[PDB]
C-alpha cells in the first residue's frame, strides 16, 4: 500500500516547543524502520523494548511520533524514569515506554544571531507531569508565599523560559530536534507494518 510519512515528521521545517510537544498519529501505511536508522546522521538513537531491524517484521495498530526541540544537555532526559525540568514539567516517558528516541543537532536551523526566542520550555510547575501529559497553560507561577494576580513581579514569574538559541553557544546549549516513536498494539487490526 502507501508509505508511512516519516519524511514529514523528521524533515519538517517547523518543530514544536517541548512544553507544547506535537503528536502525529501514523496509521495505514508501510514503514521501513531500517531506512530510518540507515540515515546515520542521528547523534541519539536509543530504543526501548524493541530494536531497529526488528521493527521491520513487526505490526502495530498505531505508531506515534512526538517531536520537539530542546537543548543538548537535556537530551539525556528524554528517556524512561529520568528526572529534570524537561522530564518533569514538559515531557515524561512512562515506565513501560516502548519505542525509540531519536535526536540530532539543529544549530543550523534553529539558532539565530540575536537569539531565537520561538523555542520555549516550562521551568516551574506545582506538580510533576504524568507520562505523555502536556501542559500548555500560561498562568504566572507563584514561587513565593503571596499570590500573583495574573501579573509578574517578586517571586511571580511567567513559567515558560526562552531557549534563546544562538549559533555561538556551546554544544550543551544548542537546539536538538527530537523525535520519540512510540509503538502501540491495541486488540485491533494492525495497520502499521514493516515491509515484511
Amino acid at each position: 500500500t502507501n508509505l508511512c510519512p516519516f519524511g514529514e515528521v523528521f524533515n519538517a521545517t517547523r518543530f514544536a516547543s517541548v512544553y507544547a510537544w506535537n503528536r502525529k498519529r501514523i496509521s495505514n501505511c508501510v514503514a521501513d524502520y531500517s531506512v530510518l536508522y540507515n540515515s546515520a546522521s542521528f547523534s541519539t538513537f536509543k530504543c526501548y523494548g524493541v530494536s531497529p531491524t526488528k521493527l521491520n517484521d513487526l505490526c502495530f495498530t498505531n505508531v506515534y511520533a512526538d517531536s520537539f526541540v530542546i537543548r543538548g544537555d537535556e537530551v539525556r532526559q528524554i528517556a524512561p524514569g529520568q528526572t529534570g525540568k524537561i522530564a518533569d514539567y514538559n515531557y515524561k516517558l512512562p515506565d513501560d515506554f516502548t519505542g525509540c528516541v531519536i535526536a540530532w543537532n539543529s544549530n543550523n536551523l534553529d539558532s539565530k544571531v540575536g537569539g531565537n526566542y520561538n523555542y520555549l520550555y516550562r521551568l516551574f510547575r506545582k506538580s510533576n507531569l504524568k507520562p505523555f501529559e502536556r501542559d500548555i497553560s500560561t498562568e504566572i507561577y507563584q514561587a513565593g508565599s503571596t499570590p500573583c494576580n495574573g501579573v509578574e513581579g517578586f517571586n511571580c514569574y511567567f513559567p515558560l523560559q526562552s531557549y534563546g538559541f544562538q549559533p555561538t553557544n556551546g554544544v550543551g546549549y544548542q537546539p536538538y530536534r527530537v523525535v520519540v516513536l512510540s509503538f502501540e498494539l491495541l486488540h485491533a487490526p494492525a495497520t502499521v507494518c514493516g515491509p515484511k
Epitope: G115, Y117, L120, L123, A143, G144, T146, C148, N149, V151, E152, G153, F154, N155, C156, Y157, F158, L160, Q161, S162, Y163, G164
Partner: antibody, heavy 122, light 108 residues
C-alpha cells in the same frame, strides 16, 4: 562588583528613533529580570519596561506601548531599548535596572546604571 | 497598578534631628519594598530593600519598617550628606511604581 553602563543617549529629532544599550557585568546576567526606568528633568521616577530573564515575557507602561521595544542578549550581557516616534514628553534620563532573580526566592536589592540623557529636540 | 503615596513631599530639619518618611501602598505588598536615595545629579541608589534590610555601605542611621500597606524610612540623626530626594518603590508586581519623592533639606 556589579556594573551597569548605559550608552546611546543624545539628541534625537522629534518623531525619530534612538536605541539605548545597557552593558552589565559582575553577576550572571541571564538570571535577572531587567527594566528601563526614566526620569524627566526635575520630575520623579517612571518605570516603563521589563523583560524577564530569558526574554520570554515583556511589558510596557502605557505612555510607551506601541513606540518602544525592550530586548536583551544574554550572550553579550546587554539590555536594549529601541525607541520610535519620539516626542517632547520622552526627554529624560533613561536608567537600566536589574531586578528579580528567578534563580532564588530571596529578595535582593535592585541595581541601577548611571543614566543616559536623551533629548528630543529639532 | 499599585499606587504609592509618599509623605511628605519635602521637609527641612537640623543636623542630628530625626527624620521620618512614609509610604502608603494601595494594596498589601507585604515586604516587597525598597527605599532609594538620589543625590543631586546622581542616579537613585537603594538604601533599604525588603522593607528593612540595610544595603551594604549604608550608614546605620538609616532603617525602615512596615509591612502590608504602610512603610516608614527613618534617618535617626540627620547628617549634612543626607541632602537628597528619597523614593519608595513597590516591588510586588509589574509595572513597578514609585512614590512622589521627599526632598530633604538641611536647616543651618
Amino acid at each position: 562588583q556589579v556594573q551597569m553602563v548605559e550608552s546611546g543617549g543624545g539628541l534625537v529629532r522629534p518623531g525619530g528613533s534612538l536605541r539605548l544599550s545597557c552593558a552589565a557585568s559582575g553577576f550572571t546576567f541571564s538570571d535577572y529580570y531587567m527594566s528601563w526606568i526614566r526620569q524627566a528633568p526635575g520630575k520623579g521616577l517612571e518605570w516603563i519596561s521589563y523583560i524577564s530573564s530569558s526574554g520570554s515575557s515583556m511589558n510596557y507602561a502605557d505612555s510607551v506601548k506601541g513606540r518602544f521595544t525592550i530586548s536583551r542578549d544574554n550572550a553579550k550581557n546587554s539590555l536594549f531599548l529601541q525607541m520610535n516616534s519620539l516626542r517632547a514628553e520622552d526627554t529624560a534620563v533613561y536608567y537600566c535596572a536589574r531586578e528579580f532573580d528567578l534563580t532564588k526566592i530571596i529578595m535582593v536589592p535592585p541595581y541601577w546604571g548611571q543614566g543616559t540623557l536623551v533629548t528630543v529636540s529639532s | 497598578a499599585i499606587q504609592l503615596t509618599q509623605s511628605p513631599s519635602s521637609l527641612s530639619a537640623s543636623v542630628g534631628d530625626r527624620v521620618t518618611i512614609t509610604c502608603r501602598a494601595s494594596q498589601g505588598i507585604s515586604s516587597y519594598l525598597a527605599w532609594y536615595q538620589q543625590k543631586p545629579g546622581k542616579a537613585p541608589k537603594v538604601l533599604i530593600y525588603a522593607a528593612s534590610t540595610l544595603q551594604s555601605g549604608v550608614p546605620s542611621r538609616f532603617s525602615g519598617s512596615g509591612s502590608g500597606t504602610d512603610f516608614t524610612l527613618t534617618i535617626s540623626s540627620l547628617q549634612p550628606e543626607d541632602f537628597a530626594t528619597y523614593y519608595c518603590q513597590q516591588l510586588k508586581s509589574y509595572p513597578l511604581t514609585f512614590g512622589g519623592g521627599t526632598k530633604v533639606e538641611i536647616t543651618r
